[PDB]
């Protein structure tokens, strides 16, 4: 039974394996030979948000491109104003070890979660006075790695017991359940129209899903180690991926296979965060030798370097209009770059 | 016009800043511990003697926050980066024991846990050595060097037990020490103990060793130790 069914899955791999070999007309370096390059560019640290005690794990930008949230391991959840460097709110937490933070695109709710296995939802509007816990979500059994809001009523969450989930905030129960992976799920990136999303996990695979069906559409495999970060292209057909074997890759949803691989011999440390710029030309790749290296996305050349940190970077965001880049590392300092 | 929101952005800032200066001082006054020991009796007895069980307790008016890791999966490479800043890892123990040694090797040789110190316990030493000394077969088919092993004379063996329990009790203790001493280089230590039967000084041996780790840490910051 299992002997010929392993071969049946093997032959369905192998037929899939040569269909992408059928599609491979040429490499993308051959068609991007004559793109005149971006070349010698660089940035500068403009701000430094220094208010946290312990290490910073996650930040998320705002739809105004002005506010941002910082979650850190001291049990503090802190909203900033990036323009005037002012702490708008300083939320205390229930449990300390948090790993992810959410900022709803309505600007009206904030979530965070970690090893106490609960995504908690915090209200920002709070006309009764100070902020408080609105409701919280307890369905996962592993830990809690990522989360991304859709409206003020549903949020997709990424966990460590392999299962992603879509939630209903008023009734507190999960709507669907995503059971495709095998490892700890690490990060998920929403499509720009919130019709799809991809997710990376520790089993070196990248699953593309459907929010309405709860099913896995495609499986992307081009990495060698566990994957820490993922981020869509701005249109919705590509994503970049960062894994712990020091390589960034590019996978297109149409041709169903990989396109580019961003590596260099001197970088042999793992990747913790990636994000795209607004056009898509500049790809950012937070590293473990403590410097965010700006990678070209069409020519695979590390054109720019941001080198201002003391410890490992852990989170990296780009404003939705492309004015600023904020990176936060384990030294409790969040240099806003520009 | 624009000064009106400015002072509110000032007055919210200073009222927040006063709360942080309550929180930084209490955070520097409390020591976190990690209790990743793979033993069900060990993880629960040393409490008296969800996703995470927070136990807090004070001794000599010093605040400890002890954190048992509970509802997690068996893979560990992604949630022990959330503990590099801790004071002391309390590795409790219960082939079980080669898998115990293979785990303690990885923690000592992590890129991020390279600088954190390990307090090591030896649970059940009465019911893991004399259990073999009634069976006379279990260490030898787990270890060949035990028949070669001599009890070190600079040990302080307790009078009133089987001396060949203490032959194996010190053998296991000297099997963790050969991993910790080999290529650790002065930035993190190991502290073997065993109480495991009474409420007396399970925590005090942790107390008098957590006090040590900080003292090695400050003398590390002066190029002395």
């Amino acid at each position: 039974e299992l002997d010929q069914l392993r071969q049946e899955a093997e032959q369905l791999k192998n037929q899939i394996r040569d269909a992408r070999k059928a599609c491979a007309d040429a490499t993308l370096s051959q068609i991007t030979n004559n793109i005149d390059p971006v070349g010698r560019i660089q940035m500068r640290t403009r701000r430094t948000l220094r208010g946290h005690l312990a290490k910073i794990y996650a930040m998320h930008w705002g739809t105004d491109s002005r506010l941002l949230v910082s979650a850190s391991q001291d049990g503090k959840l802190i909203i900033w104003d990036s323009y005037t460097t002012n702490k708008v709110h300083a939320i205390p937490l229930r449990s300390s070890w948090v790993m992810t933070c959410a900022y709803a695109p309505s600007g009206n709710y904030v979530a965070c979660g970690g090893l106490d296995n609960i995504c908690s939802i915090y209200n920002l509007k709070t006309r009764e006075g100070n902020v408080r816990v609105s409701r919280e979500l307890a369905g996962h059994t592993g830990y809690l790695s990522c989360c991304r809001f859709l409206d003020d009523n549903q949020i997709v969450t990424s966990s460590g017991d392999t299962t992603c989930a879509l939630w209903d905030i008023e009734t507190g129960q999960q709507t669907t359940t995503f059971t495709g992976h095998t490892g700890d799920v690490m990060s998920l990136s929403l499509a720009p129209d919130t019709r799809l999303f991809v997710s990376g996990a520790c089993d070196a695979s990248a699953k593309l899903w459907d929010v309405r069906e709860g099913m896995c559409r495609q499986t992307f495999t081009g990495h060698e180690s566990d994957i820490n970060a993922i981020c869509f292209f701005p249109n919705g057909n590509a994503f970049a991926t960062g894994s712990d074997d020091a390589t960034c890759r590019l996978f297109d949803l149409r041709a169903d296979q990989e396109l580019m691989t961003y590596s260099h011999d001197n970088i042999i440390c793992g990747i913790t965060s990636v994000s795209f710029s607004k056009s898509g030309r500049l790809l950012l790749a937070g590293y473990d030798d403590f410097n965010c290296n700006v990678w070209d996305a069409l020519k695979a050349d590390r054109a720019g370097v941001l080198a201002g940190h003391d410890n490992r970077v852990s989170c990296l965001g780009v404003t939705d209009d492309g004015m600023a880049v904020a990176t936060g590392s384990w030294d409790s300092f969040l240099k806003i770059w520009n | 016009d624009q000064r009106n929101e400015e002072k509110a952005q000032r007055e919210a800032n200073k009222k927040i800043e006063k709360q942080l200066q309550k929180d930084k001082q209490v955070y520097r006054a409390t020591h976190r511990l990690l209790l990743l020991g793979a033993g069900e009796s060990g993880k629960n007895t040393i409490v008296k003697q969800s996703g995470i069980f927070e136990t807090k307790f004070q001794v000599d008016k010093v605040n400890f926050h002890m954190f048992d890791v509970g509802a997690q999966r068996d893979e560990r490479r992604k949630w022990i980066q959330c503990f590099n800043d801790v004071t002391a890892i309390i590795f409790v123990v219960a082939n079980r024991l080669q898998a115990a040694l293979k785990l303690f090797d990885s923690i000592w040789n992590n890129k991020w846990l390279r600088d954190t110190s390990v307090i090591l316990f030896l649970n059940k030493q009465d019911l893991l050595a004399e259990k073999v000394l009634a069976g006379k077969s279990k260490i030898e088919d787990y270890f060949p060097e035990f028949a070669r092993y001599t009890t070190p004379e600079d040990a302080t063996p307790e009078p009133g037990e089987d001396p060949r329990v203490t032959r194996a009790k010190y053998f296991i203790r000297d099997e963790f020490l050969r991993i910790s001493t080999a290529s650790g280089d002065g930035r993190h230590y190991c502290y073997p103990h065993f109480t495991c039967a009474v409420d007396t000084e399970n925590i005090r041996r942790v107390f008098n060793d957590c006090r040590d780790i900080i003292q090695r840490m400050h003398l590390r910051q002066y190029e002395l130790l």
Epitope: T182, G183, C202, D203, A204, E224, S225, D226, D244, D245, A246, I268, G270 | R73, D74, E75, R76, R77, A99, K102, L103, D105, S106, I107, N109, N110, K111
Partner: nanobody, 126 residues
Amino acid sequence: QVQLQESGGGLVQPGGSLRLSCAASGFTFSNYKMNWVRQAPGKGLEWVSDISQSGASISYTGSVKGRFTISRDNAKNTLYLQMNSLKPEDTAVYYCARCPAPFTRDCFDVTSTTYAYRGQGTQVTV
């Protein structure tokens, strides 16, 4: 895509000898500290051996010390475990594994429950 194919195994009279192989796929073989893991029936998984990148560091389990050996080939990207003087109680499913990251020392892969950088294994009997 990475995948691991162990080969060999089968039957032996109690006391014989055997080798094993590990077919690698799709990664830089010269980077990863690799290892063997067995699992007896009726019991959980247990660690057998390991070899480093070059082949300098080599360690074993105490029960199987001396009688076995491990060797790697960083030119033809396969892993080799030659076993000698086999036992009646060594009958177990033998997997080939890889520690999850390049250029390191630590490993966290003795577990069951899809450590997804191990192969499905081969059966050795006696």
